[PDB]
Write a protein that binds this ligand. Structure first.
Ligand SMILES: Cc1cc(OCCCc2c3n(c4c(-c5c(C)nn(C)c5C)c(Cl)ccc24)CCCN(c2cc(C(=O)O)cc4c2ccn4C)C3=O)cc(C)c1Cl
Length: 151
């Protein structure tokens, strides 16, 4: 499943980098150029999204009461509820990932960094399993990058 692996490398790097403040300088895998431009796209757009929904993000974070990895594994159901039904567009997907980053920052603050990568997996798993065909028709991460690109 190459779509899942690409999505997880992008999402995982964006989440851990938002939580630690440090960029990950390890080379990317195949489709490296696209994934690097996708992660740059998320650094430009994602922080605007998080500031924009700060009130709603904080409310939802508190209502989910995340404390350990078992809590992290119990988040897919609400995630799926909020994300699955209705219209899909790239902004919705950025919002998914962006709240992911918001939560990853929280996990780092309560010294639960080890939960960031299960978080990332859960996010990727919900994305690819619920939006795969859409992702394929928007040409995947190249479609994402082209969508948010301005010259
Ligand atoms: C990591 C993780 C990610 C995650 O992601 C879930 C999917 C992303 C998401 C959406 N929404 C969220 C809200 C939220 C709520 C509730 N109220 N308000 C005001 C907000 C901003 C919060 Cl607090 C957090 C995340 C989201 C609802 C509104 C925007 N929207 C959207 C919803 C719709 C729609 O309902 O059809 C259409 C949309 C958008 C955005 C663009 N379009 C077209 C979403 O799909 C969820 C969880 C639990 C986890 Cl753990």
């Amino acid at each position: 499943d190459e779509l899942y692996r690409q999505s997880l490398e992008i999402i995982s790097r964006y989440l851990r980098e938002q939580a630690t403040g440090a960029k990950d300088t390890k080379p990317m895998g195949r489709s490296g150029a696209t994934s690097r431009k996708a992660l740059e796209t998320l650094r430009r757009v994602g922080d605007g999204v998080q500031r924009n929904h700060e009130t709603a993000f904080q409310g939802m974070l508190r209502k989910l009461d995340i404390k350990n990895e078992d809590d992290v594994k119990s988040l897919s159901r609400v995630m799926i509820h909020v994300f699955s039904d209705g219209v899909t567009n790239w902004g919705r997907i950025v919002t998914l990932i962006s709240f992911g980053a918001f939560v990853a920052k929280h996990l780092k603050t309560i010294n639960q960094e080890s939960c960031i990568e299960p978080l990332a997996e859960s996010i990727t798993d919900v994305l690819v399993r619920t939006k795969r065909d859409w992702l394929v028709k928007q040409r995947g991460w190249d479609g994402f990058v082209e969508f948010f690109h301005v010259e």
